[PDB]
Amino acid sequence: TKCTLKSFTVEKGIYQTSNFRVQPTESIVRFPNITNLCPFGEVFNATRFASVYAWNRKRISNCVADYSVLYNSASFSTFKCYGVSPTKLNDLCFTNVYADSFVIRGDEVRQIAPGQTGKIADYNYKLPDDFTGCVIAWNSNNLDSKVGGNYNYLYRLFRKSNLKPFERDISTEIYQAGSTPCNGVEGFNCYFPLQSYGFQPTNGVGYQPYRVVVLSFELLHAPATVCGPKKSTNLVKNKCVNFNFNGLTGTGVLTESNKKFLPFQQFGRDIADTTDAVRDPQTLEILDITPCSFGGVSVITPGTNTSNQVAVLYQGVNCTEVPSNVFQTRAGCLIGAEHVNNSYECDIPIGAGICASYQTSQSIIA
Amino acid sequence: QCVNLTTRTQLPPAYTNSFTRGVYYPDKVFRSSVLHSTQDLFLPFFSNVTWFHAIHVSGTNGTKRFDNPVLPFNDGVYFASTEKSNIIRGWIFGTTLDSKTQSLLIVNNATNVVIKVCEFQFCNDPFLGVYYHKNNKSWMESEFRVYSSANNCTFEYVSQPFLMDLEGKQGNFKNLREFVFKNIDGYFKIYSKHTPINLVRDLPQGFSALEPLVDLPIGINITRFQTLLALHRSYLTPGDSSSGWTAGAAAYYVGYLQPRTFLLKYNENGTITDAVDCALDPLSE
Amino acid sequence: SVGLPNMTQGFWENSMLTDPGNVQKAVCHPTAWDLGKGDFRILMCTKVTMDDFLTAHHEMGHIQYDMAYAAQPFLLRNGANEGFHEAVGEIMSLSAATPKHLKSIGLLSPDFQEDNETEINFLLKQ
Numbered sequence A: 001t002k003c004t005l006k007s008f009t010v011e012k013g014i015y016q017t018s019n020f021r022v023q024p025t026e027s028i029v030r031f032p033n034i035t036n037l038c039p040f041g042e043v044f045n046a047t048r049f050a051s052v053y054a055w056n057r058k059r060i061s062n063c064v065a066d067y068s069v070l071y072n073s074a075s076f077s078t079f080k081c082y083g084v085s086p087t088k089l090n091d092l093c094f095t096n097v098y099a100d101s102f103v104i105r106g107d108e109v110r111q112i113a114p115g116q117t118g119k120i121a122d123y124n125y126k127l128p129d130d131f132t133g134c135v136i137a138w139n140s141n142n143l144d145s146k147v148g149g150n151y152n153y154l155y156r157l158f159r160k161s162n163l164k165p166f167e168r169d170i171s172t173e174i175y176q177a178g179s180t181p182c183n184g185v186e187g188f189n190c191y192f193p194l195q196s197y198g199f200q201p202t203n204g205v206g207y208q209p210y211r212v213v214v215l216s217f218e219l220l221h222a223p224a225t226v227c228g229p230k231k232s233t234n235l236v237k238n239k240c241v242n243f244n245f246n247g248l249t250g251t252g253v254l255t256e257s258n259k260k261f262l263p264f265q266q267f268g269r270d271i272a273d274t275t276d277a278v279r280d281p282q283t284l285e286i287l288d289i290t291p292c293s294f295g296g297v298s299v300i301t302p303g304t305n306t307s308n309q310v311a312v313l314y315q316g317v318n319c320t321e322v323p324s325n326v327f328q329t330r331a332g333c334l335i336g337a338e339h340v341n342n343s344y345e346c347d348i349p350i351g352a353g354i355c356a357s358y359q360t361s362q363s364i365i366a
Numbered sequence B: 001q002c003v004n005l006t007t008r009t010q011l012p013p014a015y016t017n018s019f020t021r022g023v024y025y026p027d028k029v030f031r032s033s034v035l036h037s038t039q040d041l042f043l044p045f046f047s048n049v050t051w052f053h054a055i056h057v058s059g060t061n062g063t064k065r066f067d068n069p070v071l072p073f074n075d076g077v078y079f080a081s082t083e084k085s086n087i088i089r090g091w092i093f094g095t096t097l098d099s100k101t102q103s104l105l106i107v108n109n110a111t112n113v114v115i116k117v118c119e120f121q122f123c124n125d126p127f128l129g130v131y132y133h134k135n136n137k138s139w140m141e142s143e144f145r146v147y148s149s150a151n152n153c154t155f156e157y158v159s160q161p162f163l164m165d166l167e168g169k170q171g172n173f174k175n176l177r178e179f180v181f182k183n184i185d186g187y188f189k190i191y192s193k194h195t196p197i198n199l200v201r202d203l204p205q206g207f208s209a210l211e212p213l214v215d216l217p218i219g220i221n222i223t224r225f226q227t228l229l230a231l232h233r234s235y236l237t238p239g240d241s242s243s244g245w246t247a248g249a250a251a252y253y254v255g256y257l258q259p260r261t262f263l264l265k266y267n268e269n270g271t272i273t274d275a276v277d278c279a280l281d282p283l284s285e
Numbered sequence C: 001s002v003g004l005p006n007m008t009q010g011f012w013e014n015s016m017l018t019d020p021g022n023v024q025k026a027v028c029h030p031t032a033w034d035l036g037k038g039d040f041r042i043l044m045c046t047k048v049t050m051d052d053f054l055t056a057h058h059e060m061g062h063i064q065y066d067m068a069y070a071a072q073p074f075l076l077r078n079g080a081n082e083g084f085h086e087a088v089g090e091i092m093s094l095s096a097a098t099p100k101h102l103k104s105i106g107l108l109s110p111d112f113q114e115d116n117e118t119e120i121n122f123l124l125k126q
């Protein structure tokens, strides 16, 4: 009060000094349930895979891609994410996802990478210079290997020109290396384009089958349909906290309300366009949003020449949110004044018909 | 697959007036007796909407009407169909309606709502007729001539199967099915509402707030739509695939939206009970 | 310890390093199998003697040379001449038969003195 009035002698009366405000204790973020994750549970555990020249592109558009189950699993040999960090995969949205599944030899897995060249890249499947996605590969020598030679997987070896990024060729015309035209039959420079691979159960590292898939992420003029799985928190009702209900934000105490919303309405607003009620996206219950307690701090004190005792008043603040008698008045919580049942002339006006005075072993009374 | 429909009497288009309809919830915000005023694309009160009907009179008289033109899609449309039986079983949205661009297909084949977003090749007269036989006498839906092929599908949705009451009752109308389509930010919003009524003259008079039903993120452009009707194939009506048709008790209205200002009124529970147009009848201003 | 990589995974699960006996007939001649598809195995009935101890290092050097030149087409997966492939293992077998290596591994006693008579005898035998 001395600093507010800029004087060492404070006269008898009530003076406003500061403003009280209940600071938020913790912050909660709530989101709806995460069901029907993606067809990733079937695109990785498929029993049959296609060749490298006939790779299948599965439509992954509308499903919550759970990248945590793929990054935490310690069953992938090569896991390199280009243009994006593996940890930030569950914090960004995308438009369309495509998983190209195909089996390739182990010693030539390094050819499927941006900026790399070789024999399988420019002839079977080539990646652009810039790529926004990850690569997943795992050894499949346990089940994709039979005694006698596995001639079920083939690959395109001979081509007349380089392939474009994300290009798939179906025509299997015979290659021509010389000036003599190939009349549909093999000859000197007329060879078959497709060549079969040999997968034996006794082969060493490098020649074993490795099921490698490619994830492609693209962003165009369309609403994002695939996002990362956001995690919720616990619901704490009766305390000043920071809430986040599916994009919303603010600060207030969440008390159980009785406003029966409509089956499609999410949050409610009272007059003057203020968010006062939201629905929990998980339990579908409604609750009110009351702002946290705040108000001016007034210090009732007599003259400095009389005494140095003071009475603190929190205007419009209940006594249960303040943290030497503590008495609750209709004007606010008053601390430092003894409430008496007698009636005297109003000396220091407080409010709501209550006044304070410095009388009788000697303290401020209300 | 594409089969035309000949022997159809042409008539000038009819018009009616929608007194107070097309009012939908602009956003998912609960309001309890606050009388909010919003600025969005609604249907103006007492507008001039088009009336498409399908009448068929027995004998060598009457008119054979089967209305399903390619109507434009100007900033949203209002579809209200006074149906006696299940005849209107879907719509078609798009710009080119061919393999050039993509098109939205929301069609019902008597099982459930089937929504597909691909580059179809729609015919010039798509329909989903019924077949009425003498043995196993029950209205069955065996007809699909909407498009020829389907390639480059982006979005698809087929809900759980369900029965369909294709009984061709005779009498008055039973219910009204209202729909408000709008696409401003890629999302295709649909606002549906079901209200029983017992008139066969014009659009019912009253007030009913349309609630949001689905929100499909497609991102495609929509400039012209078309309504898909049903047909009846029974005895005493011989003909080829492009003839021998019959219908009746089928009518749907189409109204275009425009930027307007409305003073929506909410009750103690959050439902819109009344509204006024600020750009008409200055008593409402 | 010199710089050569470790053995392959199939080398420890496909090699028959012990004579099965009378259950089946198998030749115990030390041979270096160069399959060419990442699998390398040695066929030898290695006993607990010293001659077999150095022949094992000879075969391992052969396998190392095979894995070294396995990074070339089939028409080149071989030594430079007809003597290098054997010499690569022979030099290892000669350098591994030294008493210093045997006493460093734990075969020869550390307190064994290196007299010149044994060195002269070894040089004469070589």
Ligand SMILES: *[C@@H]1O[C@H](CO)[C@@H](O[C@@H]2O[C@H](CO)[C@@H](O)[C@H](O)[C@H]2NC(C)=O)[C@H](O)[C@H]1NC(C)=O
Binding pocket: A040, A041, A042, A044, A045, A069
């Ligand atoms: C393929 O099948 C395996 C075997 O069930 C799956 O591995 C399980 O994954 C769940 C989900 O995290 C774990 O709770 C189990 O402990 C895993 N089991 C084993 C034995 O590891 C695997 O997740 C499946 N693949 C995909 C893509 O879902």
Ligand SMILES: *[C@@H]1O[C@H](CO)[C@@H](O[C@@H]2O[C@H](CO)[C@@H](O)[C@H](O)[C@H]2NC(C)=O)[C@H](O)[C@H]1NC(C)=O
Binding pocket: A033, A281, A282, A283
């Ligand atoms: C979201 O998930 C929670 C928990 O997985 C669901 O809450 C359950 O609801 C059922 C039926 O109402 C109760 O029998 C369970 O006791 C609830 N469990 C818990 C932990 O509360 C909730 O219903 C789900 N919401 C949606 C929309 O699917």
Ligand SMILES: *[C@@H]1O[C@H](CO)[C@@H](O[C@@H]2O[C@H](CO)[C@@H](O)[C@H](O)[C@H]2NC(C)=O)[C@H](O)[C@H]1NC(C)=O
Binding pocket: B002, B003, B004, B123, B124, B125
């Ligand atoms: C009969 O059906 C055919 C297709 O089943 C349609 O013919 C199209 O007619 C329009 C103009 O009349 C042309 O622009 C199209 O090119 C025609 N289609 C084809 C594939 O050529 C039309 O619905 C009906 N045509 C007639 C003459 O009745």
Ligand SMILES: *[C@@H]1O[C@H](CO)[C@@H](O[C@@H]2O[C@H](CO)[C@@H](O)[C@H](O)[C@H]2NC(C)=O)[C@H](O)[C@H]1NC(C)=O
Binding pocket: B109, B110, B111, B112, B114, B141, B158
């Ligand atoms: C209505 O259309 C839906 C989808 O166009 C049909 O559902 C398909 O039915 C076939 C065989 O009846 C199945 O092989 C498909 O798998 C179904 N689709 C899906 C997405 O599951 C439905 O059968 C049609 N109903 C009628 C009466 O024609």
Ligand SMILES: *[C@@H]1O[C@H](CO)[C@@H](O)[C@H](O)[C@H]1NC(C)=O
Binding pocket: A318, A319, A320, A329, A330
């Ligand atoms: C303060 O809180 C208590 C407990 O909830 C309540 O009984 C009392 O009425 C409150 N005071 C005021 C002024 O609202």
Ligand SMILES: *[C@@H]1O[C@H](CO)[C@@H](O)[C@H](O)[C@H]1NC(C)=O
Binding pocket: A339, A340, A341
């Ligand atoms: C004032 O009156 C109340 C209610 O009768 C009583 O509980 C309280 O003790 C009284 N205080 C004094 C100081 O008499």
Ligand SMILES: *[C@@H]1O[C@H](CO)[C@@H](O)[C@H](O)[C@H]1NC(C)=O
Binding pocket: B015, B016, B017, B048
């Ligand atoms: C609706 O428009 C048509 C054509 O412009 C016109 O003939 C008709 O009279 C109009 N109806 C009303 C009620 O104005």
Ligand SMILES: *[C@@H]1O[C@H](CO)[C@@H](O)[C@H](O)[C@H]1NC(C)=O
Binding pocket: B133, B135, B136
């Ligand atoms: C039964 O229904 C089928 C329609 O699938 C129809 O073709 C047939 O004529 C009906 N009657 C008999 C006896 O099959």
Ligand SMILES: *[C@@H]1O[C@H](CO)[C@@H](O)[C@H](O)[C@H]1NC(C)=O
Binding pocket: B152
């Ligand atoms: C499908 O249509 C979209 C429209 O933007 C286009 O980008 C895409 O390349 C098309 N895909 C195929 C396989 O035609």
Ligand SMILES: *[C@@H]1O[C@H](CO)[C@@H](O)[C@H](O)[C@H]1NC(C)=O
Binding pocket: A221, B219, B220, B221, B222
């Ligand atoms: C339709 O919307 C698309 C948005 O992807 C836009 O590219 C196109 O130009 C629009 N068409 C017209 C005629 O404005």
Ligand SMILES: *[C@@H]1O[C@H](CO)[C@@H](O)[C@H](O)[C@H]1NC(C)=O
Binding pocket: A260, B267, B268, B269
């Ligand atoms: C509002 O809801 C209450 C209880 O849910 C109900 O008694 C009352 O009839 C409702 N009012 C309207 C206009 O629907």
